[PDB]
Symmetry: C2
Subunit: 294 residues, 2 copies
Amino acid sequence: RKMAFPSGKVEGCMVQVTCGTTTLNGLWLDDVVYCPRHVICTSEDMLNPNYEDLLIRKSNHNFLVQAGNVQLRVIGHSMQNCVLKLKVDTANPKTPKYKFVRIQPGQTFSVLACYNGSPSGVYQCAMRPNFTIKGSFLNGSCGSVGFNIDYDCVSFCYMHHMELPTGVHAGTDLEGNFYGPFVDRQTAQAAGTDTTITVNVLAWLYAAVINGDRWFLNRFTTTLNDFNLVAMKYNYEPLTQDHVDILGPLSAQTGIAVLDMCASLKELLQNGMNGRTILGSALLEDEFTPFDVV
Amino acid sequence: FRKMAFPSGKVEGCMVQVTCGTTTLNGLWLDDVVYCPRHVICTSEDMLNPNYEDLLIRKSNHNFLVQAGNVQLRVIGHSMQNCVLKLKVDTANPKTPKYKFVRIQPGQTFSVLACYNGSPSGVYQCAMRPNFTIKGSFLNGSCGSVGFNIDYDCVSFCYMHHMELPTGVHAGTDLEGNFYGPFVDRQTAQAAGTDTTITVNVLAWLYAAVINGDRWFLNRFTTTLNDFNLVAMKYNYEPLTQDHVDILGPLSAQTGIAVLDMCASLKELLQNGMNGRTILGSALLEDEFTPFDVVRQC
């Protein structure tokens, strides 16, 4: 099962930020509230927003920040790339141990979906190769964040900014830099053709062998180049020597060489499932990383 | 269209570790009581045919070790309610949420906070199968993990994990210690019955697809509850009742597709497949969203 991290450490950091007629979510860590800078935009502004001109015209008291039933007083503001940083006069007593990390496509994380500062649900997802998220982002879920938790340290990696026409979602790291080519502007931007995360599928197949499913193995091997030539015909990401190195431990644990598992994958793409399941799925799952499987 | 778990923070603050002898599992600490599976008092030898009433008479408070993080809680009383052990402790949990104990029906969904030795590891959304099992991951060492729904600020606890069945699925009780399904907390041979598909949930998920603009499977036809149920039985689908049709009423009003019209859609899919098309980017029919879940998410 795709499990999300327990969300309590992040729930205690979610707040509501209102600027004018727009309200979205913010992340309250120590004495700073982080939120998407488009909170300062009207719908008209979003076609061609000049964020520097829009922000110079704001005073601290233009930002209403609510943490539950308590109003937080904003005492300073600044913009870092596409994120607004509101300095408040109270450090969040519930701030967990945290860091900010920028992730790469294929990496997984949990999203705490929030509405007007109130947590609604938690889900596990992956950064797609086209730099989008296939999420469940209710209309007012901008500012919801993605995170991993490792030994009680929350690593924040994603903040939600935009919905794309195909229904998928785009956003930034917590330093405000977008993932992919997207911008916080209402333009014609569109998610590029998405691809399957090949190294995640192979990590998952190793998990299946570890869990005692072997029916999809075969007696063939492949070269790396021949595998890539075939897999790209199915819209699979190319497998790199780094990816082969990353699977090394799981190869040693199951005694199945990586290119032998690649041969199995090639045949699975050619044949399908024939009614069988792999770890309870009728689909090749690509949202478990090799770190996740271990 | 993603499955979403409930935010787990209110429950994380209630998880503790319970140790009796060599056995450790998870317990739920609400006010001054810790709830956990009664089989924590059982040795591997006693598991073949335990007499829990006798085994607990022979235990004292000093036999139980309860740890809330870095804090040992002192047990000051013990009792059983059905298959759940209740340990009265010297301290009330200051993080106790508003909560209720509820019993759910097959086909209903809930979130599980998987825990290892009192330490929450992950959260996932699942459904109670018609055969009264859960397809989850537990863990190993996940006994005593709980399932729940949240409504406003009230946590409704509905499940506690007790055992893994040979097919890898999971069996447990409500928080009053009543098992879901024909299972016992003894080391004997038991198996999940043949499972079926939760028909009312598949229909909810089809309404969700139409709400999301996936409409290719809609057709001009309608069926009868009777005629559909014979197609369902032939495909290992739970029969559909008038209460089911009534529960789907809100979705049929919002979308304009009557339930027996959607049932004709479903019957056609069950006989002819998707013909290379997908529904909500998927090629199998999902049955772990309830009608309530779809309304809440749409």
